[PDB]
Amino acid sequence: LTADLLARTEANKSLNDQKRAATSSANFERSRLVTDGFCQFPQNIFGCQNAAEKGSVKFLSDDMAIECEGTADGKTCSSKAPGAYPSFLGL
Amino acid sequence: WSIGSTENMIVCFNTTAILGAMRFGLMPSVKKNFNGASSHTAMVEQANAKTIGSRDPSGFTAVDVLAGGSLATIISAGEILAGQVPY
Amino acid sequence: LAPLYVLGNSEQSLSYLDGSLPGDYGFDPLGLSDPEGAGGFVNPKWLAYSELIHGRWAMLGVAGMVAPEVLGGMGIIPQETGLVWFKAGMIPAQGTYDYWASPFTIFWINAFLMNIAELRRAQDYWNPGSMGKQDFAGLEKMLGGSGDPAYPGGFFNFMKQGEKDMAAMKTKEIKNGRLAMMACFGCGAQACMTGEGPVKNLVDHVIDPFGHNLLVNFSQIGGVSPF
Amino acid sequence: MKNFQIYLSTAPVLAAVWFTVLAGILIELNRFFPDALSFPL
Amino acid sequence: ERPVWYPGKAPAPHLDGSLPGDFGFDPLSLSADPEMRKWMVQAELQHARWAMLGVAGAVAPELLTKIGVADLPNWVDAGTYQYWAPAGPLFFIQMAMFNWAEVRRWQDMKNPGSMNTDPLFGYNSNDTNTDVGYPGGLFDKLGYAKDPAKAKELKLKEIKNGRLAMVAFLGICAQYVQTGQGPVENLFSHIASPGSVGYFGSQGL
Amino acid sequence: IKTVKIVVDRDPVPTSFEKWAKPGHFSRTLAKGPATTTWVWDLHADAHDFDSHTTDLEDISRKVFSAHFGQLGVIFIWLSGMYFHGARFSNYEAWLSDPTHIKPSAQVVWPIVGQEILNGDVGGGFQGVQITSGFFQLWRGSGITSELQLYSTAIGALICAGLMFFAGWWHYHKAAPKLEWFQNVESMMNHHLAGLLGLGSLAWAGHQIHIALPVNTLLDAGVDPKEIPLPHEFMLNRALMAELYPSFAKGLTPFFTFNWTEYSDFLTFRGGLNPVTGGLWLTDMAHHHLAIAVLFLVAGHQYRTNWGIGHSMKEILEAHKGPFTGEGHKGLYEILTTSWHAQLAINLALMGSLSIIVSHHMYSMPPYPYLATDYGTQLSLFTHHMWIGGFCICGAAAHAAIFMVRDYDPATNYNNVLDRVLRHRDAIISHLNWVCIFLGFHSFGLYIHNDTMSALGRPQDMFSDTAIQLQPIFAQFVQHTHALAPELTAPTAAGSTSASWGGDIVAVGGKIAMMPISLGTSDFMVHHIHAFTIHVTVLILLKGVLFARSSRLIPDKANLGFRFPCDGPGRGGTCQVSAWDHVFLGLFWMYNSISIVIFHFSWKMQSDVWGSVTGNGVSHITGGNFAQSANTINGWLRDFLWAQSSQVIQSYGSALSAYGLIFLGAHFIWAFSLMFLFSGRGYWQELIESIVWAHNKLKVAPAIQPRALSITQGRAVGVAHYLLGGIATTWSFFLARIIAVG
């Protein structure tokens, strides 16, 4: 197993680096969504995480998009489950 | 492992010996042990656990069975795992 | 007054287990049903009522484990519908079926249906006669209760069966509920170990008891793993 | 209920609410009118 | 004895059935004080009526769009619709008007007899009325409260439809959050196939 | 022989806010209302003094139980917060791919007043406050590879916190147990060994085996976290787990037939550190937790509860007596089953000692992947758990004194092991004081003589390694026996417990995970200093406990209370006689000692262990100057305080500017504490009189009369701010230094 897993680590390394950069950028931008003007007063009435999950966010949503991009087939993605009840209060 | 193997026979012998010992007052049991006793050579009947529920004429209990089996399995583990250590 | 029933009784257990409670054999090795010091959910009435509810749910559960599998295997019901219990949509990763609605839609349906049933049952448990008073769409007449939350002799006894020997029948149901709770425990247990359904474990033990038992199954503790 | 309101009206809870709100307004003013060394004229 | 919010549970002691839609629902005892109770009955009635108007005006434009009389956006999209004035001045005048009217409401709550005479024309709504939150003479332009026997059950009907519309508006908000269309679209989508589309149907966990 | 059972009073107190609306309901003097501003401090001081609220022990026990439930809810909130921040406000996923070069960070500040500079360049295309809690290392060692797992456990922790609060409400307002429930200590030990520690360790061993072990093995092999199969795919799919570790192809048959040697691939006794991650082997930790689980499960069947087998702890106490100790341990069962403060003293003492051992064992044997290499988290964890330990020990002394004043009964302790201690407390305290003096004189002159000789230009007369050899021969002997343990006395161990004993320095990514630690003369001197400072803290605390009830100066001190300011200026002056005041001074010395322990740790690790191998020997952080400079006070002042302060004082304009600001602020708080410490109430009360005159002049006079702090409260504030300022100064210094140097 470890042989093929290392082989596809080598074959997918660039995409996972992009994934890690995107999630880190999302996590950092999560402190600047009002200063930069992404989840302002209207859009963040509910959870701005829910805004990123459902609506549109410059960085958070990006991660939401690539987080499950190009993952292993057959297995549920390491970054997110197939489904889940909504985050507690969009938190 | 199989029936009649050395490990199976060790554990069966251990549990038989332990249960017999505490059934006939040779080992501390639920209804007779050193709680509130006098010296090392004499155990005493435990009034708190006296008549705690059994259909065995010596008053052997399920907790007696469970305790003897646990201690026997512990001892059998110690004895069997001797000689399995790598060194 | 039988083997495996004197194991649990003692001075404490026999002090309060008189025997008039249905299927009271005195087997209370722990001090859970002690009337003095009772409170919360460890009071004897709650335990007796919960034992009965668990027994009834276990009888329904074991019957729903055995029936789809047996009936598919013989051919009574469709094969696609005769799934094993744990592959019939309970766990979608394990297995699911394409029902009329989405499995989560069904979950929500059955959820609020169980809400409306169980809360009425609870209010009979806490306030006995109050379930027949408020106008519940004209259905309160047959949901008054009986004063015993365990045995409401209203709609639910519409056949009026087991009336000539109610005491004997009361014991019958407790013992069957105990047996079915153990049965459902087993069915989950050897579904977790063997990886097959309970009927297949049964027949495998019938054919080769010495090759399809617990101790042999230790080597093959997953069968074929679907994860 | 009413007693809880009275409990809120206690000195510590009221101090915490008043300073939470005050810090909030001051932070918002320093966000929308940031970096104000002196009153402009 | 009366029907309650939860059969078998005694109604809240501070609730004695002397209010419209009284079903003994107050597990938090938020209206134990009668002074607080008056204010809160007024809050329920005001929120009820606003939520009903809210549902009516969030459903009617989309229904007219579906019928074909006129083309109108959803309740949410109406915010960004470009009107004669931006949202600033429009809301400004709206709030001026509501400071006028809501000061009149506030002083009706404080003083029931107050705010029963026109301050500009001298018209008398109701000469010495006391029922706060129900200014019949002021707003009953059809005389549907001239009989107390009629009036009390009409009050009950109002409260029920109001609570239903409060729940409906909360649902409208949550639906637009979770789906993205107007309520009436979501309704017809659920109507078309309740086994494929809907919450837990579209796999929108 | 009472039967162990569940006992409860149903609905003992109604749930209502009426007591919230009325401050000070729990007392009688505080219930009437505030006459003076002292009332506020009295309210907060006795908020959790349940013994002084109600006389009956049942209500006190219920209050303690539900307060413990509330604390556990608070801890679960804190854990939920930490996991949630590690999910939405961190670079844990980036750090997973590059743990050696990315700084862990799970706090991002809002950009408001220029504080955005605190969001340091921690790596991974991320900015935030670098964290030193080691949470990232813990999560990696637990097998967490995605932020969803962190979010999921955070939400679980929040649910559990809600459940903990609900349990406290249930067990005070709905199902409060009776006093005879809490006094079932036999059952308590049976459950808290077999079920809390035993089953908890078993559960964690199972997690480690089934989830952490495969995930961390794949990470060790170099597998990308985003390509690793999910934990349920390892726990359930036995073929997948057996692919990594072939023993899983045999199922549980070896387990149940005592063929446990077949599990030797994933249950090892390797010892040492993982060369890739620099942490303990996870197979070793799994086997550890398994054996711990078994040992505690067996040891939790010691005590008799409801079936005659087992022990009665009263009997085994009373049977232990001897010719020197009179009646022996008779009556201690009554002490520890009818006094919460006695139990609290023991448990706090052992908790504090344990936290200390935890710090030692974690620096020396890093249990987490990429923990040792991250020097900042390692220093932070060591220092933290040291401070927690010293505080808990001081509290143990305090609660020992509280029991001794309040709950000690001479009738039930006639000639037992405690009464005889009270009957020769003079000998104990005099010998301890003598020991304390001796230790201080010798150890300080070891430093002061060296200062003097160096200043006089006589290095050959110093106590350095070159001049006079005070070699710690015994510690070097222990190091030798432990380095040779895997050969003779621990033959099945593939390696030593730690690399600190000797040989085969452990390096991960250039930086040293673990290095054998040497012990020269400076180590001798600093360890004897440590013993000196410990013995003085013990002197103060034990003197307070033993002289809590009486002394030759004040015989009637028991009725004065545990916490009183003095007995007056008579008898020459009776200030700080109460055992509370001993805890005050005791707390002070505790602080002092910890300050030396953590300074020794920091300097020794920076000089002789931490560093970076470059193929040409070790390049330590400070260059190994400890062995030749840590024998002089000037050496600590210059090469440790002055030298290593450059990071914190020059931290302005960088992410460590917050550490610099805290450094100054903690200096201020310490000096501010000196106000409360060096002054007395009378002056401040008169100043208040003048200020009250000024207020009365303008009719601003408050209804609650302003009062100076009580003398006990003044000492309390002084020690609290002193400890805060000193510890926060050391915190800012250590964190800024170790983060900047790396």
Ligand code: CLA
């Ligand atoms: C298997 C049994 C078991 C377990 C696991 C525990 C566990 C615990 N007990 Mg103990 N306790 C037990 C039996 C048990 N108890 C018995 C039989 C009695 C009566 C003699 C007591 C009496 C007792 C007292 C008087 C107190 C405790 C306390 C504690 C907690 C200490 C804090 C700690 O270490 O955090 C470990 C934290 C965790 C393990 C996190 C999960 C927390 C939940 C509560 C664990 C569930 C334990 C519970 C027994 C099972 C649920 C039963 C419930 C549904 C009825 C700990 C949670 C103290 C405390 O903190 O009070 C709350 C305390 O004051 N216990």
Ligand code: CLA
């Ligand atoms: C608490 C710790 C813990 C836990 C939970 C587990 C759990 C597991 N281990 Mg591990 N393990 C542990 C510690 C642990 N292990 C330790 C310490 C060791 C070292 C000796 C091992 C070594 C080990 C090996 C070598 C193997 C396992 C395996 C397994 C799995 C097999 C379970 C099974 O079928 O057995 C039998 C279990 C049962 C019979 C219990 C099931 C009962 C169910 C839950 C009853 C529910 C019934 C309910 C009442 C009604 C049903 C309906 C309802 C749901 C609606 C399981 C996931 C095997 C595996 O597949 O791993 C990949 C395997 O090969 N374990």
Ligand code: CLA
């Ligand atoms: C398991 C831990 C434990 C428990 C249960 C208790 C419980 C108790 N202690 Mg003990 N104690 C402990 C640990 C513990 N303490 C430790 C570690 C110490 C050493 C410091 C002490 C020292 C101590 C003394 C000296 C005294 C007590 C007393 C008491 C009782 C009253 C406490 C109260 O209401 O004050 C409520 C709490 C406070 C007033 C403290 C306020 C916060 C202080 C200033 C510290 C905050 C520091 C903070 C972390 C830094 C940031 C602040 C920030 C906002 C700027 C109560 C029985 C008193 C008593 O009468 O006993 C019967 C008493 O005189 N304890």
Ligand code: CLA
């Ligand atoms: C650097 C400051 C300082 C010093 C030197 C001392 C020294 C001492 N304190 Mg104090 N203390 C201090 C600060 C200090 N304390 C502070 C700020 C607090 C917080 C309030 C305390 C709280 C406190 C308490 C509560 C206790 C002490 C105790 C002690 C003694 C411990 C025994 C010892 O050190 O061996 C002996 C003394 C020294 C080593 C001191 C230095 C002397 C050097 C080596 C010179 C040696 C002789 C020299 C050559 C001079 C001779 C020639 C000369 C005539 C010209 C000692 C007298 C304990 C005690 O008295 O019991 C033993 C005790 O119970 N102190």
Ligand code: CLA
């Ligand atoms: C206690 C700490 C300490 C120690 C161990 C030393 C040790 C020493 N100093 Mg330093 N020194 C110290 C503190 C200390 N100093 C301090 C604080 C200062 C002040 C700044 C100095 C200043 C100083 C100077 C200026 C000089 C020294 C020198 C010396 C050396 C000779 C001293 C001498 O003649 O002793 C005489 C000793 C005794 C008469 C008796 C010692 C005590 C006996 C052995 C106790 C035995 C008790 C016994 C165990 C009990 C048994 C009972 C049994 C019968 C029942 C020696 C290495 C001199 C040097 O250059 O040498 C290197 C020197 O010129 N010292």
Ligand SMILES: CC(/C=C/C=C(C)/C=C/[C@@]12O[C@]1(C)C[C@@H](O)CC2(C)C)=C\C=C\C=C(C)\C=C\C=C(C)\C=C\[C@@]12O[C@]1(C)C[C@@H](O)CC2(C)C
């Ligand atoms: C075993 C069990 C309880 C066991 C309790 C025991 C031994 C207690 C013993 C003691 O207390 C006593 C006696 C005396 C005490 O002094 C000592 C102890 C020792 C403490 C309950 C099972 C309880 C079992 C239950 C309730 C079973 C429920 C099944 C249901 C609801 C339906 C499930 C399904 O619907 C799904 C999920 C999917 C569908 O495809 C299939 C079906 C199967 C139809």
Ligand SMILES: CC(/C=C/C=C(C)/C=C/[C@@]12O[C@]1(C)C[C@@H](O)CC2(C)C)=C\C=C\C=C(C)\C=C\C=C(C)\C=C\[C@@]12O[C@]1(C)C[C@@H](O)CC2(C)C
């Ligand atoms: C007023 C209101 C809504 C008003 C909506 C309006 C005007 C909408 C207007 C618009 O759409 C249009 C027309 C057209 C668009 O172009 C413009 C907008 C502007 C978008 C909702 C209230 C909505 C109010 C709600 C949902 C309140 C819910 C309260 C609940 C459930 C309380 C329960 C309890 O208090 C009890 C009853 C008993 C206690 O003891 C226990 C608890 C549980 C605390």
Ligand SMILES: CC1=C(/C=C/C(C)=C/C=C/C(C)=C/C=C/C=C(C)/C=C/C=C(C)/C=C/C2=C(C)CCCC2(C)C)C(C)(C)CCC1
């Ligand atoms: C004669 C008689 C009989 C028979 C009897 C018998 C034969 C009995 C038996 C009994 C038994 C035979 C029992 C057993 C038991 C057991 C047990 C109870 C076990 C336990 C175990 C344990 C507890 C374990 C633990 C562990 C583990 C898990 C792992 C680790 C290690 C150890 C070991 C620690 C009859 C009845 C017919 C009749 C009458 C008479």
Ligand SMILES: CC1=C(C/C=C(\C)CCC[C@H](C)CCC[C@H](C)CCCC(C)C)C(=O)c2ccccc2C1=O
């Ligand atoms: C400074 C000092 C005082 C004086 C301190 C006074 C009495 C109290 C400290 C001030 C607090 C802050 C007063 C509380 C203020 C109110 C809570 C008002 C609200 C705060 C607004 C200003 C925001 C003592 O009473 C004292 C007593 C014994 C030993 C040493 C000392 C001591 O050093």
